[PDB]
């Protein structure tokens, strides 16, 4: 009388699903003998072997550093100047960026058209960019053709010629570039956050500067800026790939001679008008935008602060989450799990920025207008949890992730050269991989708690928000969420 | 012309001006006080604790015994 | 110990009584698992096929209607009833095993019960 | 009970303001902004009483 | 937002209604202190209830014992004069605060639409206060009370 | 605790001795597992190892039943297996600190994983598990299908990929015509058991290559043989066929500009190494740009199209000239994005350029030299980034059964000449025009009107 | 985490005992 499971399509479906479940119930050890999802430390000392980065200091004060690997076939040669938009004078804000744009063009013999023709004829690339307090002009080239690239860099950095018609054309180009940046909302958010956090300080002003100032260059400001800030002690030449240190040193010595001898040293320049964090907020409500983008930030650590590594670990254990992330609801960080499980945000990203004598540390969320209060609760809860109740497995996972991220990012010739120059400018030395790993391994739960108490516990925050933000909690909400009354 | 509220969106400045009619702003370099405030709040808080204890004890001791009963205790 | 109706007369009688009751109301033993009760049953039902879950809802509605009317299933369908032909225990076990693993190593609960 | 109904009806239709105008543009949460104002009022009343 | 795992206790169902109506209720940003007077009237009502309960733990509603019972509260009960003076002067302050409440409503025309029901329930409340205070003033059983 | 302020070396470290400054150039070892599988590796100096598993499967092997399995499989790459749950897999990857990626192309598709050189057994074991033993659960597949439907709903934002797919579908018939982005009907039809059957039928040993970038070959083979040697030996069913004859695809969308693209056949394919290299050099000569970039010299601003069109014709949003080469077939052509009113003139200009390269004498020796040097530079600067090295190993072994040494590509690019360029352009222009248009297409010329040229 | 949790619980217990003594000042219990 009772029907068999063959009939009753629901009985058939139940049988099929039960068969599949009983299929996947028995694991296998030969595919599980190495997994160990619980994180643990390891000593990669047997692996961290890289060629020595030879450093030389020409007596005019010029540092040249190379990491040669003569088995390769390409190379990257560049100049890393310790100057940027921070070192302006409140009326020449856009000078650094505009000088970049101009210095691409022409010299007493380069003739921008035929200069770029030469660059593209040898097959290489030539790029540049300016940060708040760092400037880079680098070129990627091949073996036996490095010297031409080095000569071109020296020529453009020393004997550049600025002509009025090209200056007008670049004024037009930079006004267009300013008009296209508001589409990129993340950069706008971070510019506003910098302005409202380091207000009344040289770090507050943007990189591009104001259009009213870009319209009044006249090339006298350009020449004055280059002669006052591109001095010999503040520059570093870096090379990787198939290069020879002695050849590079000889070429730099023979070429970089018409420099700007001066005394404006960035250390003394930062001694005056330092960077001062001021807790505040700016919130630009629109309600015509589909997504609300905001960022909260605490005061960070300087480049040389020994707690900078701890802050890097902490921003690794608040790792970024994305709506197309592979992990999804399963991730190491508690903040990513909270965001993904309850789907309260389109994407979150924790950032750690380091400057001289200051820095930043935040979470950069981007969500929908209705989940903002829950998202803010999640962010503040996880940060103050880092203050109070950090866990050993989380710390170990964060340290492993940080080591892996750094060593995987250093990949190629241009990344190696960029690492050499940036580290030489920030610390005065290039930190070896073994020492970097030792410093990271010196971070444990007690270290994380101490650093978070130093930087997060009951400290002012700076908020920058844009879009439909009616539901975003006010300043007092975040300010009170920076501590727990339970402990 | 520029609607003057997108000008502020497109032009972030490091010199931000607040109202300063009800509250004078500290000069930028000065630190956040954050301690004077908590100590003022603490003084008021233990004033409040004193008040609450007074009220509770008044009610309970009123519900307690009485002088005529204590006199008749013999 | 593990006492089954083959090796226990008392268990045989217990199973017989449960079969009689469920057949009277015409609903499988797994249909008694309340999704609001555990929230693991809620997930297991969320993972099951729609045909199976719809059959479960139909059987439950029939049982509730019979309960209101103060009557039992007619003897034909009562003889056609198949209690203890499970459809949920394997999925529930998988869900609980996954939850146990996630809790055991790090991890936040994928779902939680409101208060209350 | 009457006071609770009073408050429920008010909470249905918001709250007036010294201007008498529509006031759904600039609105803030009751706590902590008006709890502290009410607290100042309560302490002054306690001194009077 | 799907509430899979609970974020905040205030948004949990146990404290959700309280959350909305006490913490998260949007309020006009420019309110002066007379809205504080409304809250103060609420506090005065609570004070009256508590002191009245503890007073009724000692008051005898008989005609031959009411007055001497009140004098008992004043003289014998431990801190009873405080209870009685709090009850009486708290009735007075309750009425003072409600009068200021009403006159702010009149000044700012808060009775206008759509708060007609709020004003009407307020009128009912005022009637209840009048009746309660009158019957309470009869309780001590003095010359003014009786007459 | 005290710390040395990070501008001073940290106390006592056991930092090791550096590499010998031009140690050597590692060779690729390839071992053929007797069931028919390939395991290849090479040594790298950097502390990062990239390990990938590449399969000869994809849209070409799709079937009317599947029709979308490749895209779904890319989305369902590192999900729960019969031995580990998805949570366990993600926790393992995070624990060692590596990155997982999946790529799905028309002809072949791969799964890559990156981590430090210490974790080689973990990398290879997790990869082999996730490929060989997948458990396509209905709920996970449904989640990924929902995401894929949303992505299909957000497709028009990039007209270039849409036009590439359109050109392939229009100008091919069966195999290469099989779509890559899983239309909505196919998405609704797709299912977990369908994925299971497709994988079990296609993911077989004689079409699997495991390529490592910074891993010792002995270690890799010693950890991979106990995980792949027992796969069944199958007879490697033949590759699908596809003919080129094809015409026009036209789709109307928003009012912002029109995107027109043209393409041709060049039936050499990757097995015709000389013609593939000549096609790559021709692409690097043609190239172009988007007229909105502000990077700097070297990005091809002196290419022929860039110079002529962009420096001469304005109101043309972007102008590029591209190629796509599959085993035994090719597809080279020009992408144009311009204003709706200008579109017929834009088509005329693109045809003029494509015929200009064909007729002899119109390409200068200096331009050819620049193109050859740029191609050599692009290849060389690409073979850094060990991820690219491992991918190249895998793709080359899948195609040719070996790794063709870089010196062959360099020599071919060296020996290409103007006569070769002209002959290849003449051959490529003879094949029937393939045309696609997207946007305000109600004003672009007819396919036959455009095809009046080129013949 | 357990040492921190038990330390915090003990601190809250000390605070609770102090509040209890403040509410009910008992020298009668304090002296012995
Ligand atoms: C009661 C309702 C709240 C329950 C707790 C919920 C909670 O989490 O609260 C904290 C919670 C913090 O926000 P959150 O979003 O949960 O974030 C939590 C943090 O991540 C983390 O927050 P946290 O961990 O720092 O704080 C957790 C909090 C949670 O609270 C507790 O655990 C308290 C436990 C009971 C203690 C009993 C003693 O614990 C404490 O505060 C510990 C305090 C221990 C000592 C308390 C003093 C004892 C004195 C005797 O909410 C608040 O702080 C808001 C409270 C708002 C109160 C509004 C009162 C308005 C009054 C208006 C009066 C006039 C109206 C009109 C009158 C007339 C009408 C007619
Ligand atoms: C008739 C004589 C009229 C003389 C008017 C003089 C004058 O210019 O007054 C306006 C002038 C400020 O004008 P406003 O800005 O329009 O009023 C303040 C706002 O209401 C905003 O007030 P606020 O929150 O900035 O200040 C808080 C606090 C500041 O006051 C204090 O801290 C202590 C005040 C002690 C007064 C005795 O209180 C006040 O300012 C006054 C309101 C006090 C609360 C009343 C609530 C109702 C109580 C009902 C009880 C039951 C009946 O206030 C004063 O002159 C008072 C302060 C005088 C110096 C002492 C400062 C001590 C620290
Ligand atoms: C010790 C008790 C051991 C019980 C072992 C299982 C018995 C199961 C069973 O069928 O028990 C018989 C009966 C209930 O079954 P049934 O006869 O179907 O009742 C409804 C119709 N008369 O009755 C019961 O189940 C009564 C059980 C009483 C248990 C009391 C324990 C103290
Ligand atoms: C009588 C003398 C006085 C002393 C009495 C002492 C207590 C004796 C009895 C103790 C009973 C157990 C007490 C502990 C609470 C229950 C523990 C528990 O298991 O809670 C978990 C449960 C579900 O939570 P779950 O989803 O598991 O959490 C996610 C974590 N991964 O959590 C829930 O389901 C949440 C339940 C919410 C409701 C709890 C109600 C508790 C009782 C309150 C009574 C008073 C109510 C207030 C009004 C009157 C005030 C006087
Ligand atoms: C002590 C005096 C406490 C007074 C609390 C406020 C008055 C009771 C309100 C009860 C009520 O209606 O709660 C509704 C809520 C239903 O649950 P939910 O779906 O979250 O509803 C949100 C509203 N849309 O109900 C619930 O979730 C249950 C709430 C139980 C009551 C808790 C009161 C606080 C106890 C401490
Ligand atoms: C109404 C009053 C508040 C009732 C709170 C409990 C409500 C019912 C249980 C709710 C669920 C629960 O466990 O809540 C406790 C809460 C959990 O923390 P949560 O923010 O949810 O997430 C972190 C995960 N562990 O944990 C917390 O929020 C932490 C609170 C810890 C408080 C411990 C300290 C108490 C000290 C004694 C009292 C004060 C001493 C001084 C005064 C003494 C007496 C005069
Ligand atoms: C809750 C009930 C508290 C009851 C209580 O503490 O009653 C007070 C009683 C007598 O203490 P008391 O009269 O203040 O002291 C005599 C001189 N010091 O207290 C005692 O007899 C001892 C109280 C010890 C602390 C009890 C805390 C509960
Ligand atoms: C038991 C005494 C009373 C209590 C506890 C009480 C309580 C409150 C409370 C809590 C509010 C909201 C907060 C505020 O706006 O101040 C309020 C508002 C109001 N009450 Fe009362 N009230 C009382 C008596 C009255 C009376 C007698 C009237 C007039 C008949 C009245 C009329 C109003 C009005 C018009 C408002 C609206 C407030 C506004 O417009 O902003 N209330 N009351
Ligand atoms: C349920 C709560 C209340 C109780 C149990 C209560 C009880 C009492 C008792 C027993 C008395 C006589 C004691 C005495 O003579 O001092 C009294 C007096 C009085 N009550 Fe209340 N009462 C309550 C609330 C109120 C309220 C809300 C009011 C209104 C403001 C009020 C107004 C009065 C007045 C005016 C007196 C006479 C004051 C006097 O003794 O001279 N009572 N109440
Ligand atoms: Zn620029």
Author numbering:
A (entry chain M): 41 to 527
B (entry chain Q): 75 to 148
C (entry chain F): 7 to 122
D (entry chain O): 198 to 246
E (entry chain O): 2 to 148
F (entry chain N): 50 to 504
G (entry chain W): 15 to 46
Cite, word for word, the article reporting this structure.
Complex III (CIII2), also called the cytochrome bc1 complex or ubiquinol-cytochrome c oxidoreductase, is an obligate dimer that transfers electrons from ubiquinol in the IMM (reduced by CI, CII, or alternative NADH dehydrogenases) to soluble cytochrome c in the intermembrane space (IMS). Complex IV (CIV), also called cytochrome c oxidase, transfers electrons from cyt c to molecular oxygen, reducing it to water. In the IMM, respiratory complexes can be found as separate entities or as higher-order assemblies known as supercomplexes. Here we present the cryoEM structures of CIII2 and SC III2+IV from the vascular plant Vigna radiata (mung bean) at nominal resolutions of 3.2 Å and 3.8 Å, respectively.
The V. radiata (Vr) structure confirms that VrCIII2 contains 10 subunits per CIII monomer (three conserved, mitochondrially encoded subunits and seven accessory subunits), similar to yeast and mammals. The MPP domain, composed of two MPP-α/β heterodimers (one per CIII protomer), extends into the matrix. Consistent with their known flexibility and conformational heterogeneity, the linker and head domains of UCR1 (Rieske iron-sulfur subunit) were disordered in our reconstruction and an atomic model was not produced for this region of UCR1. All heme groups (heme bH, bL and heme c1) were clearly visible and modelled into each cyt b and cyt c1 subunit of the dimer. A catalytic Zn2+ ion was also visible and modelled into each MPP-β subunit. Our cryoEM map shows density for the Zn2+ ion, which is coordinated by residues His137, His141, Glu217. Density consistent with cardiolipin, phosphatidylethanolamine and phosphatidylcholine lipids was found and modelled into the VrCIII2 map. Nevertheless, no clear density for endogenous quinone was visible in any of the binding sites of the V. radiata dimer. Thirdly, a ~ 50 amino-acid N-terminal extension on VrMPP-β folds into an alpha helix that forms extensive contacts with MPP-α of the same CIII protomer as well as with VrQCR7 of the opposite protomer. The largest variability component revealed a near-continuous conformational motion in the position of the head domain of UCR1, demonstrating its swinging motion from the proximal b position (close to COB’s QP-site) to its distal c position (close to CYC1) during the Q-cycle (Xia et al., 2013; Cooley, 2013; Berry and Huang, 2011).
